[model samples]
Target: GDLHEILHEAVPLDANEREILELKEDAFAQRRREIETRLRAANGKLADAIAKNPAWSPEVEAATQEVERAAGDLQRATLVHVFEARAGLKPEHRPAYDRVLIDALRRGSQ
Candidate 1:
């Protein structure tokens, strides 16, 4: 099977995980859209006059920074470790190949 097929088949998220992922995705999209809309409207605005401008203010930069910080926090929040020794690779599931390989290399050097 293809890598995408294998990955999709192996990585199945539960409802709660799905919800968190969807919320994170939606939040990022919403923040990006809001910033883009503000930037688009400020295309012709003067840089020096931007501070004194009333209607269109400098909120997008700060919003974008907030989004970046949130994304960084979210990165650490979603992490998974799925290492099963029984589920062998293309060969036997004896003592786990990764552990066996490391052991052999270390023993060979000694």
Candidate 2:
């Protein structure tokens, strides 16, 4: 996904700044793991129930809601990290940052 390339490209950083960014990335990775675990568990339960009957039931609705909640949390975590990183960029670096972000987003959508 070229994450490392875009994250540091055009943004000059001292050792301390680089370390801070790495820490934030690590935190986000932990949050990602937690959300993904929740999502997998919810999906497993949903699949197990669906195996019994093809129709959606109240149990299916509950599982769906759980998955939605986890996904929303993951998205919010991602945005928070992005905004925080952007805030740290120098004015001159902002254009490059924006460009990289847009490009990465487009690639993801594809």
Candidate 3:
């Protein structure tokens, strides 16, 4: 029985700590999925380009250009979605969804 005294155990997390841990894990999972999606899309485009232009050194340049274009599209889409999610809509302001969502929802704790 005295053997247990040789070690100290960490105190268990309280409710708030547990909630924060859950939120952190969720954020990590979401970000991982998003990054992987971008990476896979870029890789697919490269593979397609290489298959079509097997003899050419210029494939790298073309693939790079395609990746850049995709990156731009991703950036624009991300910005718009982020802005939209935070855009809170009042019943009266629902018609102006874009503007109200950006102005109202964004200003909150988020």
Candidate 4:
């Protein structure tokens, strides 16, 4: 499946699951921060057009794709980290794990 497909689900978790996620979420800070930084730069490139109110053009389309790529890259790394931790969980778990961390990390739209 593709990266988008990896997070195509969601669910709720109790305190234990939430606690498990938070600490390990910290473990990913260093690597994912760089991807976030790249995404911010890509997003910044797109924002200029919005700030200037330019007409839609091919350049804008390309920048948008680059932004998406950066987003997906971060998402991929996130999956790697989460999957590693998921492998260590004692209780059997399902995949909403990707969705949980991705949504929390994204905050408001990445």
Runs of candidate 3 exceeding 4 Å displacement: 1-16, 55-59, 62-110
Better of 1 and 4 by TM-score: 4
**lDDT (10s digit) by residue, model 4, range 1-110:** 43323432344456776677677667776777887788788777778877776767666787888888878887678668767667545454555665565665576466
Per the 3 Å backbone cut-off, how many clashing residue pairs does candidate 3 have? 2
Residues 1-110, candidate 2, lDDT per residue (tens digit)?
44445666645676756676787778877888999999999999899889988678988999999999998997788877777877766667678777877877778898
Model 4: residue 38 alpha-carbon error in angstroms: 1.7
Best by TM-score: 2
Sorted by lDDT (best first), the order is: 2, 4, 3, 1
Instruction: Estimate every model's Cα lDDT from 0 to 1.
Output: 0.43, 0.78, 0.49, 0.65
Model 2, position 100: C-alpha lDDT score: 75
Clashes of 1: 0
Which stretch of 10 consecutive residues in model 1 shows the poorest summed lDDT?
79-88
Clashes (N, CA, C under 3 Å) per candidate: 0, 0, 2, 0
For model 4, give the 10-residue run with minimal summed lDDT: 1-10
Q: Kindly indicate the candidate among 1 and 4 with the higher lDDT.
A: 4
C-alpha TM-scores of all predictions: 0.27, 0.71, 0.38, 0.48
C-alpha lDDT of candidate 4 relative to the true structure = 0.65
lDDT of 3: 0.49
The residue ranges of model 2 lying beyond 4 angstroms of the native Cα positions read: 1-16, 103-110
